[model samples]
Target: EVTPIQQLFLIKELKPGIARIGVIWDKNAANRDEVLPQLQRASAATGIKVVVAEVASLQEVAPQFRTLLRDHQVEALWVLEESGLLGQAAARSFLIKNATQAGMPVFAPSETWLKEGACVTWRKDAEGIRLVVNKAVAEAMGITIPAKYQDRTAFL
Candidate 1:
């Protein structure tokens, strides 16, 4: 599992001038409690605003997600697999579709997101971890990722 702090730092490094990052959490999730504070602290430490949208159930995802991506001036959207809302493929596909429509690049944890909605995704194995970049999405979003960071990925 990717830690919130690690995610934040990676987003910062991957996208320059990333002032805002949008995240979603379940209202019933106590795990979200711990992660939220960690993200808040990391946001403070990194100078990036970590914006959140809360949802109570599956049906609430689109509306709340819309509020987060449409209402707020977030620079990017981050989806953590830990969230119950984003754990489902259908939910992720929906959010990614909306984010893509807004030209908003998503940072996600699942490897499949490399082609779907996320501009970047990574995998953790017994050997270690590997980051991946979706060149198609990156080009579509017009982000020229620095060579140094691109070199860290398993696939360029």
Candidate 2:
């Protein structure tokens, strides 16, 4: 596991911009309160805005997620990767649908996102996933990444 500050550094190095991060979490998550401050600090350093949203139940996800879009103006979506309430398939499908339709990038809290739909995923092999996802993100956003990043992946 890496610090959110480190995650920001990696993200800024790859996809720099006025970053808008969306966090949709469960209020009961065991370690959430502990990690959120770290994430906030990282966002401050990277000049990324973090918008936090919470849900009481899985049934509220669609509505809460919609609120995140309309109210938070979130450009990138991040959710807890491995959730006990919503299984992987359901969560992935929901994220994929929203991202594809909204033209926003959806990120899973885990590395499993690489094969799913995330533009940049680092849960597994940090260097490898970073290299690949950065390039993939550029392509998806219709922006030209530098040759350095382009060669980092097969996405020409």
Candidate 3:
């Protein structure tokens, strides 16, 4: 539920604003490569800086993921795909937990991350991830979302 919804809302909410997001993706995912150029353009248009880290194999995940925090100053770390990475909610929870502990916001590749304790997520839905993201934004900001917004949009 929290995958695409949060993504769009985040872009809309923070675009040209306080936060700039960075992402990590498996180099071999077909969908990733196909979508990267578009994402880049989107980032450019939004004035958001996106830094991408490439994972070559599963073994690379731990170290590469660590480097995004230790070496890179990414405000948010987004896992763009599951290839060569842990996709399950529990595993992502563990990872996101660690990232937050390190003072970085960790986003997931799926809605399951919220179930696993991600700070925020754009959950998937029929209206194209609107609801889940709204809920997440409210949750992350520690605000009570208006029922009007919830009814007008789809979310957690």
lDDT of 2 by residue, 89-145 (tens): 775667657765777765456545656666654442445433445346546655333
Better of 1 and 2 by TM-score: 1
Candidate 3: misplaced stretches above 4 Å?
A: 1-9, 12-16, 88-91, 123-128, 133-156
- Return the TM-score for each candidate structure: 0.83, 0.74, 0.67
Per residue, candidate 1 scores C-alpha lDDT tens digits across 1-156 of 667887787778778788988887767766767888898998998899998888777789888877887678787888776446567677778878888887788887676666575788866556554578787787677655556555557554
- Least lDDT summed over 10 consecutive residues: which range in candidate 1? 143-152
Query: Residue pairs in steric clash, candidate 1?
Result: none
Best-performing candidate as measured by TM-score: 1
C-alpha RMSD of candidate 2: 3.6
Q: Worst ten-residue run, lDDT, model 3?
A: 1-10
Q: Give the TM-score (vs. native) of candidate 1.
A: 0.83
Arrange candidates, best TM-score first. 1, 2, 3
Clashing residue pairs for model 2: none
* Candidate 1, superposed: residue stretches over 4 Å from native: 28-30, 124-129, 144-148
Tell me the lDDT of candidate 2: 0.63
Q: Is candidate 2 or candidate 3 better by TM-score?
A: 2
TM-score of 3: 0.67
